[PDB]
Design a protein around this ligand. Structure first.
Ligand code: VVP
Length: 191
């Protein structure tokens, strides 16, 4: 999480798509889904990001429908967006022990207990928190086993990005779970 507003320049694909779904939260507009291999994913939009402006117009107070209409009605030559980076999330760095543990339990991507005297414990990992990213890779909508596998495969250092569940549950509301599994970009970013 950068403490930064940043500008992205985005460009509709052949199909007139940017690969984005937006959600109204607390009178802002937040990214609910970034589609794989999309304009939004290439410019590095992330689940949880706040859209401050689209083409220089302020997003405050907009409904989700308005935000999707706006994106649709724009000329797809160049859309500019002003982004605040994943403001509802935090990143925690942890170290695997010798037996390859960081020291929590999670169910449906939500952390539910911290294991006594673990790295997770020393680092102040909280429960009632949804896992959003692992080492910069979105894991939202993957099965628990697959999150476990990314944790195994990771080096001894592990970075986790988490969001209070009440906020997480509000963002993903009305988005059908299979879309999250299928469409939400789960790739390492490209260079
Ligand atoms: C294509 O028209 C729409 C787009 C988005 C939201 C909508 N609600 C009622 C119609 C409608």
């Amino acid at each position: 999480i950068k403490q930064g507003i940043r500008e992205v320049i985005l460009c509709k694909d052949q199909d007139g798509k940017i690969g984005l779904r937006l959600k109204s939260i607390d009178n802002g507009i937040f990214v609910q889904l970034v589609q794989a291999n999309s304009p939004a994913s290439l410019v590095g939009l992330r689940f949880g990001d706040q859209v401050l402006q689209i083409n220089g117009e302020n997003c405050a107070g907009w409904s989700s429908d308005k935000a999707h209409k706006v994106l649709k009605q724009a000329f797809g030559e160049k859309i500019t967006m002003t982004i605040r980076d994943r403001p509802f999330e935090r990143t925690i760095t942890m170290h695997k022990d010798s037996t390859g543990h960081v020291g929590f339990i999670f169910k449906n991507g939500k952390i539910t207990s911290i294991v006594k005297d673990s790295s997770a414990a020393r680092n102040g990992l909280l429960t009632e928190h949804n896992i959003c990213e692992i080492n910069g890779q979105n894991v939202i909508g993957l099965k628990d086993s697959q999150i476990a596998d990314i944790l195994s495969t990771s080096g001894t250092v592990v970075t986790i990005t988490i969001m209070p569940a009440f906020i997480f549950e509000h963002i993903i509301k009305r988005m059908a779970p299979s879309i999250m599994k299928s469409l939400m970009d789960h790739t390492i970013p490209e260079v």
